[PDB]
Design a protein around this ligand. Structure first.
Ligand SMILES: CC1=C(/C=C/C(C)=C/C=C/C(C)=C/C(=O)O)C(C)(C)CCC1
Length: 137
């Protein structure tokens, strides 16, 4: 699969509820939700090696990983974690996260290239899922 692109959002669902599970208080959630409405996602892929940059007005992240090799990043609410991405299937990667310290909801994220040329991202916290869809600019 070729995840590479400058991806523009066309749909966002359930981010506020994700943040509620993660315990983000009401006024911070309001800020986060507004900014996360227009995120820019840049992906560069070379085989099973990836770079992903996510940009919003209130948070920008960059990660580098190889599928099947543990790495460190943060949860969406900003807690450090150890992560491991696996191919769930040919066009879909799944990242399991384990907190470095403390206890919290079980979190993960996924990226899938859909047959229409678009990209589905999910983020999960326990049972609750946020779904975003993108198309290249
Ligand atoms: C949660 C949260 C915040 C905002 C986070 C945002 C805006 C995340 C966007 C993530 C995306 C957009 C990820 C992706 O799609 O890969 C701020 C900074 C207010 C601090 C309080 C907790």
């Amino acid at each position: 699969p070729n995840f590479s692109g400058n991806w523009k959002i066309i749909r966002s669902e359930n981010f506020e509820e994700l943040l509620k599970v993660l315990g983000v208080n009401v006024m911070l959630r309001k800020i986060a939700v507004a900014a996360a409405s227009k995120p820019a996602v840049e992906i560069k892929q070379e085989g099973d090696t990836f770079y992903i940059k996510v940009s919003t007005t209130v948070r920008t992240t960059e990660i580098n990983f190889k599928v099947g090799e543990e790495f460190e990043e943060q949860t969406v609410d900003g807690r450090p974690c150890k992560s491991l991405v696996k191919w769930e299937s040919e066009n879909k990667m799944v990242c399991e996260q384990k907190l470095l310290k403390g206890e919290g909801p079980k979190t993960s994220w996924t990226l899938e290239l859909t047959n229409d040329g678009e990209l589905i991202e999910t983020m999960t916290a326990d049972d609750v899922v946020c779904t975003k869809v993108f198309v290249r600019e």
